[PDB]
Design a protein around this ligand. Sequence first.
Ligand SMILES: [Zn+2]
Ligand SMILES: [Zn+2]
Lengths: 372, 372
Amino acid sequence: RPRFSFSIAAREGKARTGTIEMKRGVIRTPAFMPVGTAATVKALKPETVRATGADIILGNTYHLMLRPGAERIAKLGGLHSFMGWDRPILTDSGGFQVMSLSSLTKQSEEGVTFKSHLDGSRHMLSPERSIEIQHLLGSDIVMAFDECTPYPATPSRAASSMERSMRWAKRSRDAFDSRKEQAENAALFGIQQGSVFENLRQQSADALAEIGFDGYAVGGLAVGEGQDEMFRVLDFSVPMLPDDKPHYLMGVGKPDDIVGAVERGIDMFDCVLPTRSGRNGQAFTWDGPINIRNARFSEDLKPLDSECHCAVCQKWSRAYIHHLIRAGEILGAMLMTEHNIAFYQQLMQKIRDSISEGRFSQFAQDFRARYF
Amino acid sequence: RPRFSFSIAAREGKARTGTIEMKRGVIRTPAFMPVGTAATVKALKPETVRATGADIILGNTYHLMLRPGAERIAKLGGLHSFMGWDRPILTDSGGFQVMSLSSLTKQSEEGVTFKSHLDGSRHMLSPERSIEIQHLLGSDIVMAFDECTPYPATPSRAASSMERSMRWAKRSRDAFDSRKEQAENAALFGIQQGSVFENLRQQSADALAEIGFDGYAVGGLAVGEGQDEMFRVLDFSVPMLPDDKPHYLMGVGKPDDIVGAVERGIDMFDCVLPTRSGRNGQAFTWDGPINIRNARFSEDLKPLDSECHCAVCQKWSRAYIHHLIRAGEILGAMLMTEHNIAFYQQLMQKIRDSISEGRFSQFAQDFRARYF
Ligand SMILES: [Zn+2]
Ligand SMILES: [Zn+2]
């Protein structure tokens, strides 16, 4: 296969379905990427992640650089070999986590210095170091390093951060391009900023297109603005991005959000919701999520969801999983997580099919009616 | 297959290898039974437990009666259906845990009353109720309910407890026999008591044989006496049990203990060591156990054990598992546990083969030389 090749097979309104071909595999879009925080998709073997239908997973650069460490992973053969996942891996730049997880952060035009949340060790990140770390991990889809904008944001601050982010986008592009093996085997995505301001989103989009990337992410959303606002921002933001490249909405999960985002032109998603919510007791069903710990499931012999084709729903009852989660058993986390990730992949499949068949609008409608 | 049929295919000294045929499946002996505390072998799907080679697992009656509850499990279809394991299941009587885990225990000739360690609920157990609970769980191999003897024990106390245990053995036998469906589909094992006293062990053995059971367990060991003492007790105790029935050494795990026990006539074992030690960071290898958390494994690309044929050793490195355990990742527990249980099953296979081939003595010798 080629280094990177995105092809759109069908459209319906702003929605698109197609594939991204990369050396390690084909990615079907719209796609949902399970999150592998510290070189592991929590509670699941890689083969299980693949069994649910995932074509690619996401790796957190921030966590990985802290432990086991970027250089260590490279010495060990790369993230793929390390964790046992041989298909595409997209790595975030690590910038978002630095701001939300680390402490004593010192930001500058050069980059950011911070202290680990694990211990007191000092660490540094910049466009060049972030790109370098993603190379060490052996990432297939590299995300440009940027500076996030907290919500709510003032026009002035949003502009400054977006402007710095665009300057950092160019540095990321050059860093990536100067590393032969990376430029030849991986892909680089740029990230659009601008908060909820249309003019800034337009400026960011133009700057990004000017530089040129393999894909464009819509950053700065899913941070407290609410679905209504997020959708409004997507309404005018996605159209600003190059139509022939993938559109990636970072940090957006939750079924309804995904459906609405696809309706607005988004091709890729990632979210910890499936995994995290699974461990906490929340299981997704076509009739909406259920809290398996609730006493009403204590003797419910039915599977988590009546339609789900995952291995968990084929073999175990809500009653058993209810017991497992209440008892704090690891298998509880394993089964809930497998089902939720499978549910998400089934959602993406239904979205891809309905778009290809020109009935996505109806699907979105039917989906919401039952889900809510 | 029959309700129960034990056949010895080969012998070497006091060691024996053969099979136990039951309605739900064949059990190869000597056998090791993974422990499924609360309707789950910690961190493993049932199919994974089976993949390691296990022919049967053990269920803890004490824990199960506390939660999800015996009656509830029966209403749900039984333990097998509940947890997804369709092969034989041996359930302990719950007596040992009552003494070591519960509080405010009130013992009498009728039975024992106690309070849960989970909450303050009151519970009761006796020969009749224990047998009844094992029936509700749908156990294949039922253990008679007895009264354990703490170590060290005085001749007088050991005699009293053993005597009460034998009286309770008869009650267990009658309870089991009066329940048609249980007597026709399950098996009942008696438990030998007597502490470290030969005369008492002989009296217990005679009383047990007098009543008649499908198998005989050696109870009261592995509670602090040390291997030397345990072996000494086994030396004269096992020969007292009927030769044509299975001999089950309760709570004995740890590789060397198992090998020595088999050398002394033991056919069945169970122990939490494999699972628990796995979660804590201890992995078994033919060169002895290793603590995967140790810094020396941080960049060790080799598998947990150089010979192990388990899925974990075929796919992941010590370095990766080292990272997982230090990071507290669930997959760390999953992989360590799968490997340890597989290691134990491989140990039992090597024991069965060497006995059948008349070279068990040499195996035991070679095993210890390298293991230590
Ligand atoms: Zn499911
Ligand atoms: Zn192994």
